[PDB]
Ligand SMILES: N[C@@H](CSOO)C(=O)O
């Protein structure tokens with residue numbers, strides 16, 4: 001039974017129930033994520049920006065089953081083209097906008113990766129991706145507005161691949177938390 005999360009804290013309690021079991025109901029997780037109405041006061045503690053690139057800020061470690069984190073994208077900051085390491089990956093905008101570009105998995109041959117499509121994710125919208133859908137790049141293309149997103153990955157993962165748009169070649173990248181539970185972890 002899916003209720004509206006009243007607060008970020010309420011959302012987190014609800015996610016612990018939804019991930020109590022071995023499987024994931026994606027549409028339900030996505031629906032509850034979308035239904036949370038972003039309230040900046042509730043997440044200011046996690047919203048720690050870096051001038052030069054986007055940051056990942058751990059919010060909740062889950063029940064063994066997922067990580068919840070807040071990413072803060074300065075003006076012009078974006079990701080690589082990457083995968084999600086056999087995990088569910090949910091992305092909800094808490095502030096500003098992000099452009100999401102989708103790519104197919106590259107073939108063996110070295111070859112420019114062409115965009116499958118792109119969309120603009122707006123405040124409070126929740127997107128979903130997994131490796132079976134494809135790869136994506138996420139960017140704050142704004143010149144004036146920082147963006148903040150709320151991401152849920154299950155199972156948790158610490159590593160992923162970045163793809164060279166010109167060749168399709170991939171490189172394993174380890175991901176680091178800029179902060180955990182509101183504490184800067186340098
Ligand atoms: N996967 C990237 C961000 S876009 O993922 O929805 C990351 O978590 O660093």
Ligand SMILES: [Fe+2]
Pocket residue numbers: 082083084089136138
């Ligand atoms: Fe991603």
